[PDB]
Design a binder for this molecule. Structure first.
Ligand SMILES: *[C@@H]1O[C@H](CO)[C@@H](O[C@@H]2O[C@H](CO)[C@@H](O)[C@H](O)[C@H]2NC(C)=O)[C@H](O)[C@H]1NC(C)=O
Ligand SMILES: *[C@@H]1O[C@H](CO)[C@@H](O[C@@H]2O[C@H](CO)[C@@H](O)[C@H](O)[C@H]2NC(C)=O)[C@H](O)[C@H]1NC(C)=O
Ligand SMILES: *[C@@H]1O[C@H](CO)[C@@H](O[C@@H]2O[C@H](CO)[C@@H](O)[C@H](O)[C@H]2NC(C)=O)[C@H](O)[C@H]1NC(C)=O
Ligand SMILES: *[C@@H]1O[C@H](CO)[C@@H](O[C@@H]2O[C@H](CO)[C@@H](O)[C@H](O)[C@H]2NC(C)=O)[C@H](O)[C@H]1NC(C)=O
Ligand SMILES: *[C@@H]1O[C@H](CO)[C@@H](O[C@@H]2O[C@H](CO)[C@@H](O)[C@H](O)[C@H]2NC(C)=O)[C@H](O)[C@H]1NC(C)=O
Ligand SMILES: *[C@@H]1O[C@H](CO)[C@@H](O[C@@H]2O[C@H](CO)[C@@H](O)[C@H](O)[C@H]2NC(C)=O)[C@H](O)[C@H]1NC(C)=O
Ligand SMILES: *[C@@H]1O[C@H](CO)[C@@H](O[C@@H]2O[C@H](CO)[C@@H](O)[C@H](O)[C@H]2NC(C)=O)[C@H](O)[C@H]1NC(C)=O
Ligand SMILES: N[C@H]1C[C@@H](N2Cc3nn4cccnc4c3C2)CO[C@@H]1c1cc(F)ccc1F
Ligand SMILES: N[C@H]1C[C@@H](N2Cc3nn4cccnc4c3C2)CO[C@@H]1c1cc(F)ccc1F
Ligand SMILES: *[C@@H]1O[C@H](CO)[C@@H](O)[C@H](O)[C@H]1NC(C)=O
Ligand SMILES: *[C@@H]1O[C@H](CO)[C@@H](O)[C@H](O)[C@H]1NC(C)=O
Ligand SMILES: *[C@@H]1O[C@H](CO)[C@@H](O)[C@H](O)[C@H]1NC(C)=O
Ligand SMILES: *[C@@H]1O[C@H](CO)[C@@H](O)[C@H](O)[C@H]1NC(C)=O
Ligand code: NA
Lengths: 728, 728
């Protein structure tokens, strides 16, 4: 008999997916690493040369974590001494290498403890942030110009985000934005003076005698938020004036009446910038479009160019208002917004007209706009076959909206139903990346004729390996509840037999705009559970889930911990009725939001689930951060939504855990969902006399992603599931 | 078919030991609390009167925690609003009730949040500490005189101890000592300015949005220690208009040359005080004897009255240098010290002579001196039947040391082998307290002819209830290692059948001077495990254990985590070869020091133990406090004992946990053994890929003693042991 996909296979990566990560450096060349050499490829013909020999930095004396070539090709920025901070942020050292002199720059180096660095989009200017202030270098070997003087650790952040803006607003650490040709540098400044601190212990190596207390400005729901200001500096003036003026652009009056956020910054032209602002009550946003006034040196935002985006049924955007994509002249833009039926589609705006024109429509959604040329807009959607969990690339003719071509749908329809794309600098070529349901496939295409040029990586080596393995299958389908389709997937054991009763594990996330039923190919823990342990691993996208319109997504508005929890319970009941599930052996697990839902389900008293595992769960919404929580829950005040905040805790359900086996797991240095959240769950369970299993992971954060802890946690959870299901 | 002693019996206190806690108020009367009344008893005849009616405080408006009657009987101090701090420390509110005029005192009340209060030993003066400063009240209704003005939270402590002096030196929060008639008040002042702080999170009620960070001055091994000064104030010459003058008594030069401690304060007469000082290297101590000089108003300690106590094989004293017991005139004293054979015996000293005379001798030890008259000294020892785990009361004729009479040995030798005693004011009467091997027995005696006056409490009610329960028995015996006998006990299941094989749990503590093999009767977790689950629960006293001389106790000097760990393995090895032990089911558990030993044993690679449980273990001596750790280990410096600090950690043994099942448990608010210690164990186990079981207890301290956590931990451990032993 062929072997199975075992736990050790998962944990040791024996069966590896190959990727093809390229970096476009122009409209027709890309960089690609191969055998630690950086090669440069010609896209049209597929030929290559060595861009940088892998021997180049043998004598560097440090392992180089990443590199970044200046847009003009003249320099390479070398990143080393890399230390992770939060999801996106990190600390590192940097050196610059002159590619023409084939020489390292030893003068006026980027300092130690630099927080962020970026090249200008053209040429080779650098902007970096060090000790919370912005610096610009016009040339890599010359002195820096200081841009801000207010930077203060944990208090004032210039050009980088604080914790909550990084995690919840920008999905990025950087808070600066070069203008398209590099003349201007726009940046945000955050003031956390009165934001309360989360404090937790970090134990470090065993040599550390006293634990360190980590202290981070972190606004929990309803707490004082960071305030924000926006500035633009002319970097071309730096070498001519002693201290160049940062010109502030103020938020509109409709935002200044209360707490608000800066949520998007997008340059439209060399002298026009768009800013979107969001009210703390996140159902109202405003875009200003601001023009540089050459005679006054100021930036002015005409109210005739201001665009309002609001929601009557929920919050604005999927996780925030969408970004605009400006036409070359900057006088019009395209933006994904929810149409009158609640489906997200592409709308076309003139900058000084308030009514836009939808250029796509239907009962499906546009996921993202990927490229815009003078003649075509390229976008990704889930239109194809009415499958919300598929993704394909489309092209729409700007002179005639009835001409829409699917570029990816029929390329390999059995193997490939989930695409992303990477366009060259002026969209002359594109790389398609298919990620399922078959093995991933990376291909290169020419935009002039939409012809396939070549296969970049087809994963045939892996395909060969998997031939000798009893792999599970995946089923993606829907059930109908109240005349609405709700999608599910199942990872099914090899030789699945519909006449047998299998144990079922419900793998849950179920956060707002989540999607756990899709066409993506994964090699993960579920692969082992199905393949080796003969467990069915199911996931369900119920109310609150994304990419299916606002009626579904906004069903949980102001009501987290209700329908999305109920719909997972109902999903399990529906799976029992399918006839191949052992009703005595249904379990549930999740991480993060999934841990909250899992815990809520286990505490519901439904009687459906024998056991479950919550990893780093939210337990009480007042413990989680303001920006995410309030987006869905409003404010925890008597005037707003306090009663539901208080009604949706895990702790209030502690008595019902007497009916289940529960394993609670949390990293002690989780900066995101504080260990506090599980500390309060455990205390509530202790207080009502409920036995349960627990595991803390010393100095692990929300990812529990260190190599040893990752292997440990999946090993511990595997034991627990097997015990619950009486598997030897 | 009668019941067993169940887990719920242990957790719910079904079978209660009755006490007889009295408080002597004179040579012939004592107070006893009965049905919320306070009675006064006549010792000679056993008749009583009501001293204070329960009903007196019916409309008090607060729950009264405790009471303290002034020595002259005129006043009662009422303690309420009790808030626990560490092992001994707490704050509370106090009111004083006048017993003669039958009224609460409303003038000049003791403030809220008072840290310590005590009556003078004669009359009804009060001293109290509030906000770290000392106050004295001459009369309950009159204003306090402020004695100290330097008190500062976490920095300067007047009249109360800091964390480490409380836990490790004085076993008390108070650092006030009244002279015998109340004229003088001596006190210590602690200065923790440069002592580092342990910091840890406290989660509190679910309502608390942000966790609190608790910060406590706590010197870990080798860290900066608190400094100490000692003062005496005359309370008879206090003034309303002038600040009180405190006279300092400075430590001897032999102490002032480096770090040191104040370790004992004992008044000898109305005008003579003795102080003992201990070097930070705790093998050298000095007693000063200081006399009040009425013409200078100063305290002088003559060098000819200094007494040095040192140890060549270890540290001084069992846990600290022993207390002196002065004669009526204060010109001589008796003190327990280690003799030339290493056995602790009573030495008689003249205050101005260097050599003392031992008045007892032999291969057994004196446990404590209990009372002293002009004709007799009364002490407790383990001499009887050469059993180190038994305790009896003796008297020795001071005119003829060959005349020693056992006063408790033969009273009831089958029921009673472990005594303590409480003498009346001038030793005219004594209460004997038998705590095993039978049910506790409380009796009253008169010293003149050692008459056994009456039985105060015989627990005949409990005896009656226990007749209908299948109770375990206790075997106390010894094994011979390298020609030394070492004692053990086994809690044996009911109907013990030596032809059957029982699983065995080794219950371990094994700290320096510990004794876990004794004749004490206990109703505890082991009782349930033996009675209901048929597990033998054994304990063993090996090298490092107490009450058997320094050759045994000092064997672990400078070497914690060696012989005491080895000796537990050897005992289990020997138990495993007895015909009634199943060698496939041997487990080990312990708490605190016992958790360290358990962990070290399970990490030894001995293969003897299937599983074990460590509750709040020490894992690395550098993490524990200076005073305890350094007593046994010296300083963690390269020139002292650093190498041994470094190879005595649990973490270094992680790989050896591969072949055992381990459950690790720790309270997150443990101020004593910081959660840090277990956090480092878990990380080390994770790092070598060893699976284990864990449980944290939110906001529990070293005792894990709140009602709900206590029930939960023993429930969780019981499941673990039963699973390990395949018991239903
Ligand atoms: C891929 O091949 C092309 C064409 O052969 C190379 O482009 C140049 O071709 C000219 C012919 O006029 C040669 O003289 C040079 O060798 C090439 N110049 C440069 C700057 O590349 C091209 O080099 C190849 N691309 C890569 C990345 O190697
Ligand atoms: C960040 O915000 C704080 C307000 O929270 C500002 O601090 C105030 O500044 C004024 C001076 O203009 C002082 O008079 C106030 O006392 C300060 N308030 C507090 C609460 O500290 C601070 O100026 C801001 N910093 C920047 C660079 O904008
Ligand atoms: C460059 O200009 C900025 C803005 O005018 C200066 O920042 C001010 O500095 C002064 C005193 O050092 C403060 O009182 C102001 O509150 C600051 N304003 C801002 C916006 O930061 C900065 O100090 C100047 N740098 C130099 C070298 O002159
Ligand atoms: C980048 O764009 C900027 C902004 O339009 C250009 O700067 C202007 O250049 C024109 C010259 O044609 C001048 O009249 C203006 O005074 C400049 N304005 C400012 C604010 O600097 C700039 O020339 C462009 N840079 C490059 C390299 O093409
Ligand atoms: C308690 O101890 C500290 C020393 O730790 C004494 O404080 C001062 O020590 C600093 C070092 O922190 C020196 O600057 C001074 O010499 C010390 N003070 C003085 C006045 O010299 C502190 O004074 C002590 N406090 C008490 C009340 O005894
Ligand atoms: C407590 O003992 C003290 C100290 O011996 C006594 O105080 C002395 O009393 C006599 C009066 O007979 C004076 O001559 C001394 O000057 C006192 N000494 C001091 C230091 O005050 C005191 O009498 C005793 N107190 C009681 C209540 O008996
Ligand atoms: C108290 O203990 C210390 C530590 O064991 C003894 O220290 C001496 O100094 C170092 C150890 O730190 C060694 O080099 C010496 O050999 C130690 N002396 C010995 C072994 O005699 C110190 O001697 C002890 N004090 C007493 C009174 O015994
Ligand atoms: N902090 C959130 C961010 C959330 N989003 C995913 C995502 N996809 N996406 C696409 C475009 C823009 N933004 C986003 C986000 C941000 C994922 O859950 C996180 C989270 C939620 C909890 F309740 C608890 C812990 C968490 F880590
Ligand atoms: N801090 C010590 C104190 C020690 N006690 C002191 C003391 N004085 N004393 C007088 C007569 C009889 N017994 C004692 C003891 C026992 C008990 O262990 C405690 C302990 C040891 C650890 F390794 C870890 C945590 C602990 F809490
Ligand atoms: C924004 O939300 C609040 C609370 O739900 C509501 O009162 C307000 O009307 C909303 N705004 C819009 C535009 O619907
Ligand atoms: C007990 O009895 C004696 C003698 O009868 C009596 O005078 C004395 O006051 C009594 N003591 C108490 C405390 O009742
Ligand atoms: C103790 O606190 C209570 C409650 O505020 C207050 O009424 C009382 O005056 C306080 N007692 C003293 C002695 O200050
Ligand atoms: C007593 O000492 C304190 C603190 O040094 C001072 O403030 C106070 O005024 C003094 N009182 C008298 C009466 O000297
Ligand atoms: Na009698």
């Amino acid at each position: 008999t062929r072997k199975t996909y075992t736990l050790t296979d998962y944990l040791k990566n024996t069966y590896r997916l190959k990727l093809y990560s390229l970096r476009w450096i122009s409209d027709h060349e890309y960089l690609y690493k191969q055998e630690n050499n950086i090669l440069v490829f010609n896209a049209e013909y597929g030929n290559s040369s060595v861009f940088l020999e892998n021997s180049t930095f043998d004598e560097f004396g440090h392992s180089i974590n990443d590199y970044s070539i200046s847009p003009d090709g003249q320099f390479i920025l070398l990143e080393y001494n890399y230390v992770k901070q939060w999801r996106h942020s990190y600390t590192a050292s940097y050196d610059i290498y002159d590619l023409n002199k084939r020489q390292l720059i030893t003068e006026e180096r980027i300092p130690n403890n630099t927080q962020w660095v970026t090249w200008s989009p053209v040429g080779h200017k650098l902007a970096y942030v060090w000790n919370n202030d912005i610096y610009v270098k016009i040339e890599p070997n010359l002195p820096s110009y200081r841009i801000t003087w207010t930077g203060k650790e944990d208090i004032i952040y210039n050009g980088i985000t604080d914790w909550v803006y990084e995690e919840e607003v920008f999905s990025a650490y950087s808070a600066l934005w070069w203008s398209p040709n590099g003349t201007f540098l726009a940046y945000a400044q955050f003031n956390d003076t009165e934001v309360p601190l989360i404090e937790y212990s970090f134990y470090s190596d065993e040599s550390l005698q006293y634990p360190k207390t980590v202290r981070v400005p972190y606004p929990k729901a309803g707490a004082v938020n960071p305030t924000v200001k926006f500035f633009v500096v002319n970097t071309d003036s730096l070498s001519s004036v002693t201290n160049a003026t940062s010109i502030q652009i103020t938020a509109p009056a409709s935002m200044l009446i209360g707490d608000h956020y800066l949520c998007d910054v997008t340059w439209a032209t060399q002298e026009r910038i768009s800013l979107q602002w969001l009210r703390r009550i996140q159902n109202y946003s405003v875009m200003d479009i601001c023009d540089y006034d050459e005679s006054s040196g100021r930036w002015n935002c005409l109210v005739a160019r201001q665009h309002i985006e609001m929601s009557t049924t929920g919050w604005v955007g999927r996780f925030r208002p969408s970004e605009p994509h400006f036409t070359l002249d900057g006088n019009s833009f395209y933006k994904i917004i929810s149409n009158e039926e609640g489906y997200r589609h592409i709308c076309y705006f003139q900058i000084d007209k308030k009514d836009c024109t939808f250029i796509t429509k239907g009962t499906w959604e546009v996921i993202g706009i990927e490229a815009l040329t003078s003649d075509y807009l390229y976008y990704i959607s889930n239109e194809y076959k009415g499958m919300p969990g598929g993704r394909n690339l489309y092209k729409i003719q700007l002179s005639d909206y009835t001409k829409v071509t699917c570029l990816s749908c029929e390329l390999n329809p059995e193997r490939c139903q989930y695409y992303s794309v990477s366009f060259s600098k002026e969209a002359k070529y594109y790389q398609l990346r298919c990620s399922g349901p078959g093995l991933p496939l990376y291909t290169l295409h020419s935009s002039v004729n939409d012809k396939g040029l070549r296969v970049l990586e087809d994963n045939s080596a892996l395909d060969k390996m998997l031939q000798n393995v009893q792999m599970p299958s995946k089923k993606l389908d829907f059930i109908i509840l109240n005349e609405t389709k709700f999608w599910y997937q199942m990872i099914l054991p090899p030789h699945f037999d519909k006449s047998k009763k299998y144990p079922l594990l419900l793998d849950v996330y179920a956060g707002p705009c989540s999607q756990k039923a899709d066409t993506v190919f994964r090699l993960n823990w579920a692969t082992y559970l199905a393949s080796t342990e003969n467990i069915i691993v199911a996931s369900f996208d119920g109310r609150g889930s994304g990419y299916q319109g606002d009626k579904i997504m906004h069903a949980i508005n102001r009501r987290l911990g209700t329908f999305e929890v109920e719909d997972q319970i109902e999903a399990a009941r529906q799976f029992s009725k399918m006839g191949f599930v052992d009703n005595k052996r249904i379990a549930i697990w999740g991480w993060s939001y999934g841990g909250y839902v899992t815990s809520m389900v286990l505490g519901s008293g439904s009687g459906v689930f024998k056991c479950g595992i919550a990893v780093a769960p939210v337990s009480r919404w007042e413990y989680y951060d303001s920006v995410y929580t309030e987006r869905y829950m409003g404010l925890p005040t008597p005037e707003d939504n306090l009663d539901h905040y208080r009604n949706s805790t895990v702790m209030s359900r502690a008595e019902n855990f007497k009916q289940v086996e529960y394993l609670l797991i949390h990293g002690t240095a989780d900066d995101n969902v504080h260990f506090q959240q599980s500390a309060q769950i455990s205390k509530a369970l202790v207080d009502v006399g409920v036995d349960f299993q627990a595991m803390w992971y010393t100095d692990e954060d929300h990812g529990i992603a260190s190599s040893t802890a990752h292997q440990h946690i999946y090993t511990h959870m595997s034991h627990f599931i097997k015990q619950c299901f009486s598997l030897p």
